[PDB]
């Protein structure tokens, strides 16, 4: 049994410094494949917008401190990277991923029903 393309062996990193390098290495791989993501899935946005989106998602977990949470977050990011590069996702999923979009006042929610 040979592992699929871009498959990494799951490993639990016990060093916080080493974990930072692995995230940085994975961060560059996302940026390098940004044009490939545009070509494979036929997106309506340029590769520059994809890299902005990738940076925004990475910055959402910048201030995560717990090392056990980092390993799960890094592992799922590797799985997401493998899914995109190998064209396993359908083009509809990637289109909706970039189709993500001042809140309403109290009265505006009140008049319509709110939640």
């Amino acid at each position: 049994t040979n592992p699929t393309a871009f498959a990494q062996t799951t490993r639990y990193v016990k060093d916080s410094t080493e974990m930072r390098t692995l995230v940085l290495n994975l961060y560059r791989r996302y940026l390098r494949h940004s044009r490939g993501f545009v070509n494979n899935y036929n997106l309506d946005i340029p590769a520059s917008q994809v890299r902005t989106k990738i940076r925004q998602e990475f910055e959402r977990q910048r201030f995560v401190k717990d090392l056990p949470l980092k390993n799960v977050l890094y592992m799922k990011a590797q799985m997401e990277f493998q899914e995109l590069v190998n064209f396993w996702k359908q083009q509809c999923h990637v289109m909706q991923y970039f189709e993500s979009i001042k809140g309403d006042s109290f009265v505006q929610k009140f008049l319509k029903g709110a939640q």
Partner: protein, 112 residues
């Protein structure tokens, strides 16, 4: 305990910022003398103030948008329920079960 396990659970953010769960022990039914259901601690979610239930006009079905409306977790101890709720970062509150006061009961008291 302190770990924010909701960051990796995959559940939507609305479970934390918009929903309230109740940790409670089921009260004894007034129509039955059994107490088996009162031996376990359970967690359920408060209903949505709107959209919890509405009537479908085609067939009279009970339509809903609350995906947690039918979820009831089972726990063996109160501490386990609190630890799980804290682990998932849920907004919760505990309803302390009512305890029955003990009163001596004998057949002689029917005349004395």
């Amino acid at each position: 305990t302190d770990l924010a396990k909701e960051l990796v659970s995959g559940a939507p953010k609305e479970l934390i910022t918009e929903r309230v769960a109740r940790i409670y022990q089921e009260a004894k039914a007034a129509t039955q003398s059994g107490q088996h259901n009162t031996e376990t601690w359970k967690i359920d979610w408060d209903i949505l103030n709107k959209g919890n239930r509405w009537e479908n006009d085609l067939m009279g079905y009970q339509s809903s948008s609350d995906y947690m409306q039918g979820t009831i977790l089972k726990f063996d101890t109160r501490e386990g329920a609190i630890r799980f709720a804290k682990g998932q970062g849920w907004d919760y509150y505990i309803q302390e079960p009512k305890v029955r006061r003990f009163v001596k009961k004998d057949y002689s008291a029917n005349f004395y």
